[PDB]
From a paper:
Plasmoredoxin is a 22 ​kDa thiol–disulfide oxidoreductase involved in cellular redox regulatory processes and antioxidant defense. The structure reveals that plasmoredoxin, unique for malarial parasites, forms a new subgroup of thioredoxin-like proteins together with tryparedoxin, unique for kinetoplastids. The longest helix (α2) in the PfPlrx structure comprises five turns with the typical thioredoxin active site motive WCXXC (W59, C60, K61, Y62, C63) at its N-terminal end.
We have obtained monoclinic (space group P21) and hexagonal crystals (space group P61) of PfPlrx from P. falciparum, both diffracted to 1.6 ​Å. Furthermore, the N-terminal helix α1 is missing in the hexagonal structure.
Numbering used by the authors: 22 to 179
Amino acid sequence: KYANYMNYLYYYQNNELKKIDSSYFKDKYLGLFFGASWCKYCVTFIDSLNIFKKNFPNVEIIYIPFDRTYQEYQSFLKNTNFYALPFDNYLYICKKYQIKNLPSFMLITPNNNILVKDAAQLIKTDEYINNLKSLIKNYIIHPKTFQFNNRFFDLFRN
């Protein structure tokens, strides 16, 4: 089906929609944020993510959108400055990870393994930072090379 899959991610900076090569995310921790602008609990969760991001600045937050319209998606990216997948239908990613509801937030290690599947519920406990720092401190990352340095077919497709 895909000759090249997920070549680019996107973000808003200085009022402008920008692209970033998906190879930028090789070898990084990621936080996959499954959300939508029309979901009140997703909008509230942004405040939890912002606190998370300050404490874990090297984890790259990626918005996986479930907006109904491109305009909704754009206003969400503008307000959060997160990186995001292009606007599209990502139900297949929900199916792969058996995501039950929005918001969800998964912490992924550099080789695409799941470090914390339930991280949206974890960060809502507001008692988690030291424990998570230690979890990451104690996790031995194993490198993994991906074709074209693009990790996302492995992460999102089967």
